[PDB]
Design a binder for this molecule. Structure first.
Ligand SMILES: CNC(=O)[C@H](Cc1ccccc1)NC(=O)[C@H](CC(C)C)[C@H](CSc1cccs1)C(=O)NO
Ligand SMILES: CNC(=O)[C@H](Cc1ccccc1)NC(=O)[C@H](CC(C)C)[C@H](CSc1cccs1)C(=O)NO
Ligand SMILES: [Ca+2]
Ligand SMILES: [Ca+2]
Ligand SMILES: [Ca+2]
Ligand SMILES: [Ca+2]
Ligand SMILES: [Ca+2]
Ligand SMILES: [Zn+2]
Ligand SMILES: [Zn+2]
Lengths: 259, 259
């Protein structure tokens, strides 16, 4: 009952170095096929207290072999642009705004790769996702090239393929583990809608030491090694079974076309 | 030297009550032609302390009389939908996702009106904007019908037409007055890029009393009666001259097509 998802990678490049190699792209696909099957070896990093909660999402990914017209494809498009940065406003997802149009969202997972991404207020970001239910025109994930794959332009600490794992988590209806409070809200007040992810104050960055306690969640602390936190690639290594329930409802519902 | 912006309002309705009247829509236009001209009678509410800073933005709005093909229009489209809520993912801006396609962004301000709006993570919202520079397909503003205009379905405390004023402020390149810090950041660290808006910690809600001091901006405090704060309709009544400058730069640059 493994769900196999066809992927198209849209490389959008301004300078030649940003037109990343097949090898770099393939290395990311390989990572997704580990993380989404619980075949990543660093799963051994999960605290013993949570070692029974680790999920095999039962999802695999392959670069599409047929394009939306039925013609053979490598599963990779490559589009030269004069645009120097893209934002969460989705300019990368339309040819008219210097990016590349989405392939049918009911048949493919669209991944756009570009050099520079910013939030609306100019914060540098590595990637962003569209949750299920949105318009097909902008469905998929976007990851910057220096945070994509495990070779080529990929740079530590984002050189282990986990930005894409995190964004595809969102694509499958998963929320940030800490609940996404706004600055005026109590840091312990919001939920990620998953019971087996401990309540958590804020995102964790970098390489935290276990345990990292917040919101009176001791002695075990934050599950900062979940892909839906903000830690360095080498530190995030698992989805929970509670998260798998959400992913499965997404696959059984809004993304049933992939079944 | 008044800039006159042609408007199209896309009413997207599921239940007939959401198919709002011409009068309700017209009442919103009337409000915009006041707020953006410093003609709102409640501008008198601004503490005299800042009377020197209150701006006439010199912008007016009209419902388009010609559609994108040059045929007569009322400047209002009405689209029936089976969709019961829209999100910040822009479903309302595409017919394919149960909404209505944008008119050319270089010639019209697109305003969508729907019954229920949510953020990505399910928070109820009254409206949202796209900032300049984004793809034309999604350019414009979205407001919920209960927060649109001053009659019909409009409900207090969002029955003075200020949601649209706030959103159109974003459309013209204005940022939240308090700087949009993330939960974990110093609340005094970010700027709205406007000198004459006092440095402000957090958004203000409801009906604060003057003064509301934050970030050592005493004795006058936060300019919480600015349209780009988060206070009730009845409490937001002004733009500043510094904001007028940013807006003029937007019309002189990315949105010069409207000149
Ligand atoms: C060098 N850049 C980073 O490490 C930034 C830091 C940051 C955090 C919040 C806001 C702005 C910047 N983080 C990201 O890129 C996130 C992805 C992780 C897994 C690397 C990314 C943030 S997207 C948002 C923009 C605005 C609000 S949330 C995300 O959650 N995608 O789904
Ligand atoms: C009944 N609901 C409300 O009053 C919500 C409350 C709220 C605030 C922040 C996040 C989620 C909900 N406020 C809005 O709808 C804002 C408009 C005001 C002027 C009325 C609206 C929030 S859009 C965002 C979604 C996520 C992050 S910011 C806005 O700034 N548009 O430009
Ligand atoms: Ca969008
Ligand atoms: Ca949880
Ligand atoms: Ca939290
Ligand atoms: Ca300011
Ligand atoms: Ca602030
Ligand atoms: Zn994320
Ligand atoms: Zn706003």
């Amino acid at each position: 009952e493994i769900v196999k998802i066809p992927v198209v990678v849209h490389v959008v490049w301004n300078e030649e170095e940003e037109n990343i190699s097949d090898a770099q792209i393939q290395s990311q696909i390989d990572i997704l096929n580990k993380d989404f099957r619980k075949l990543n070896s660093d799963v051994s990093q999960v605290p013993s207290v949570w070692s029974n909660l680790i999920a095999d999402l039962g999802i695999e990914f392959f670069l599409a072999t047929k394009d939306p017209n039925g013609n053979q494809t490598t599963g990779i498009t490559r589009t030269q642009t004069s645009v120097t940065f893209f934002t969460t406003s989705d300019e990368v997802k339309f040819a008219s705004s210097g990016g590349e149009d989405a392939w049918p969202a009911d048949r493919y997972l669209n991944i756009w790769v570009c050099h520079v991404l910013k939030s609306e207020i100019g914060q540098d970001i590595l990637g962003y996702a569209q949750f299920p239910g949105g318009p097909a025109e902008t469905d998929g994930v976007v990851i910057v090239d220096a945070a994509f794959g495990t070779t080529g332009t990929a740079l530590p600490p984002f050189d282990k393929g986990r930005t894409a794992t995190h964004e595809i988590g969102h694509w499958l209806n998963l929320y940030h583990i800490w609940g996404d409070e706004l600055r005026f809200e109590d840091p312990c007040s919001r939920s990620d809608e998953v019971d087996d992810t401990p309540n958590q104050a804020d995102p964790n960055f970098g390489a935290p030491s276990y345990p990292h306690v917040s919101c009176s969640n001791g002695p075990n602390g934050d599950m900062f090694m979940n892909y839906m936190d903000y830690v360095d690639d080498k530190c995030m290594v698992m989805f929970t079974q509670g998260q798998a329930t959400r992913v499965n409802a997404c696959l059984d519902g809004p993304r049933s076309s992939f079944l």
